[PDB]
């Protein structure tokens, strides 16, 4: 059971042009993610999937493996599918190039879940959040059943707070583990109405009846999207370097 | 493949005490529902499950079959579980006693669905509604997949309208078709967090991993909960004559 980690990293960004190359305690953001992916036990290879040569070069500079992909990919899953045809593996894990504070143990939880159930097509992560945070459409909520299988993903607060005291919210952490066969049949999947309405690609899978199991982890670190969150990550990343005893 | 229709009809109601016995164009509400259930092809028996002697007598007065059930049930589903032990069938259909405008063809669509797929445990109905009607917490929304299997039921507008013109909404019509084995294992199912927060009993089923297929029909008539709805249904059923 070979597993590889693919880190999609595209340069072009509106509010942060060249986001993966941003400096954080003296290292390009893309390098922090790569260094952490390497600490995940059970993974044979780690690749960075990009559509820009400036990113491919920055990756080669620190000795990381980069593979150029097409710029016409409408999603990070389409990019993983292209990488899949060239890089062989039974399990592909998709890590976000913009989340430098990822915990290697969290990825291992995901990988172990995939290995403990050969029939599981896709696996993802989630963590508890308060009702106030669930109110934000920018946050993706997930409701699961007893087997921790996702029932639905939405920007609307689910479950609805009819009896508010009983409601417990889960935030979806955008890291996925895909079985090789799911990626082979992916491009043949049609876009669903819920996917297009919510603008959540993972719903394309649910539309086709593909099961997505969601594992719960602790509150993850803040992702880099806005400069206000960047300073916190730089200070949080810095506070982390001088922390041991 | 034997199928029976059970109509849970308790006497009590917070706004309309004695609801099933309320007169509508000359007949108690329960009679309208019973008469329509009899028009559904492929059904072997129609039963009215009640907790009150007054309702039982009224049913027998018009030629209907009635069964006395316990008064300690909090749901019309638990009332159906009690009936399942007394009335043997492969498929049980649960019709609401307060929806006299039910179309017999809509129940046939549901029954046909159960018969076309022996593996299907539960089936229910739905119809399209506007984005406006969907914003209401009192209306239950459902989102389905390609096989029309329900992904989730919520009072929240789902799918969330990020791209408004792409969003299409479905209202859940509260009629169910249950396979016998589902009802036999019902009392063993634990209440779920989503069920308790949303106050939607069908979520107890989804939490257990039981598939619920949703069939789409045309917009349905209103039920009778409040005295305002009762006058509207009376007006409607009158002009339908
Ligand atoms: N404990 C209960 C609750 C409801 N029902 C039945 O379920 C059907 C409609 O559902 P419901 O909306 O729950 O009826 P209500 O009594 O109005 O309950 P609620 O106020 O929660 O809506 C009716 O035929 C009613 O008799 C029942 O048999 N036993
Ligand atoms: Mg009531």
From Swiss-Prot, chain A:
Name a biological process GO annotation: CMP-keto-3-deoxy-D-manno-octulosonic acid biosynthetic process
InterPro entries (alphabetical): Cytidylyl_trans, KdsB, Nucleotide-diphossugar_trans
Q: What class of enzyme is it?
A: transferase
> This protein's superkingdom?
Bacteria
SUPFAM superfamilies documented for this protein: Nucleotide-diphospho-sugar transferases (SSF53448)
Gene3D superfamilies, alphabetically? Spore Coat Polysaccharide Biosynthesis Protein SpsA, Chain A
Q: Where does the protein principally reside?
A: cytoplasm
Q: Which reaction does it catalyse?
A: 3-deoxy-alpha-D-manno-oct-2-ulosonate + CTP = CMP-3-deoxy-beta-D-manno-octulosonate + diphosphate
Q: What is its EC number?
A: 2.7.7.38
Which biological pathway?
A: Nucleotide-sugar biosynthesis; CMP-3-deoxy-D-manno-octulosonate biosynthesis; CMP-3-deoxy-D-manno-octulosonate from 3-deoxy-D-manno-octulosonate and CTP: step 1/1; Bacterial outer membrane biogenesis; lipopolysaccharide biosynthesis
Q: Which GO terms describe its molecular function?
A: 3-deoxy-manno-octulosonate cytidylyltransferase activity
Q: An example Gene Ontology cellular component term from the record?
A: cytosol
What is the annotated localization of this protein? Cytoplasm
Q: Which UniProt keywords apply?
A: Cytoplasm, Lipopolysaccharide biosynthesis, Nucleotidyltransferase, Transferase
Q: Which family does it belong to?
A: Belongs to the KdsB family.
State the protein's purpose.
Answer: Activates KDO (a required 8-carbon sugar) for incorporation into bacterial lipopolysaccharide in Gram-negative bacteria.
Q: Which PANTHER family match?
A: 3-DEOXY-MANNO-OCTULOSONATE CYTIDYLYLTRANSFERASE, 3-DEOXY-MANNO-OCTULOSONATE CYTIDYLYLTRANSFERASE, MITOCHONDRIAL
Q: Which NCBIfam families match?
A: kdsB (TIGR00466), PRK05450.1-3 (NF003950), PRK05450.1-5 (NF003952), PRK13368.1 (NF009905)
Self-association and partners: Homodimer.
Name assigned to this protein? 3-deoxy-manno-octulosonate cytidylyltransferase
User: Which species does this protein come from?
Assistant: Escherichia coli
């Amino acid at each position: 059971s070979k597993a590889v980690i693919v880190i999609p990293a595209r340069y072009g960004s509106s509010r942060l042009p060249g986001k993966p190359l941003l400096d954080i305690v003296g290292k390009p953001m893309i390098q922090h993610v790569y260094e952490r992916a390497l600490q995940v036990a059970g993974v044979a290879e780690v690749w960075v999937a990009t559509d820009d040569p400036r990113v491919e070069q920055a990756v080669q500079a620190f000795g990381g493996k980069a593979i150029m992909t097409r710029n016409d990919h409408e999603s990070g899953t389409d990019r993983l599918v292209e990488v899949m045809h060239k890089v062989e593996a039974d399990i592909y894990i998709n890590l976000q190039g913009d989340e430098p504070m990822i915990r290697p143990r969290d990825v291992e939880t995901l990988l172990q879940g995939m290995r403990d159930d050969p029939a599981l097509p896709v696996a993802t992560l989630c963590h508890a959040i308060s009702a106030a945070e669930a109110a934000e459409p920018s946050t993706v909520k997930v409701v699961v059943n007893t087997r921790q299988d996702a029932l639905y993903f939405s920007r609307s607060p689910i479950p609805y707070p009819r009896n508010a005291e009983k409601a417990r919210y889960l935030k979806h952490v955008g890291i996925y583990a895909y079985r090789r066969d799911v990626l082979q049949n992916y491009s043949q999947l049609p876009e669903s109405m819920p996917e297009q309405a919510e603008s959540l690609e993972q719903l394309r899978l649910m539309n086709a009846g593909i099961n997505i199991r969601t594992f719960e982890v602790a509150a993850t670190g803040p992702g880099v999207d806005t400069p206000a969150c960047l300073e916190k990550v730089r200070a949080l990343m810095a506070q982390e370097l001088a922390e041991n005893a």
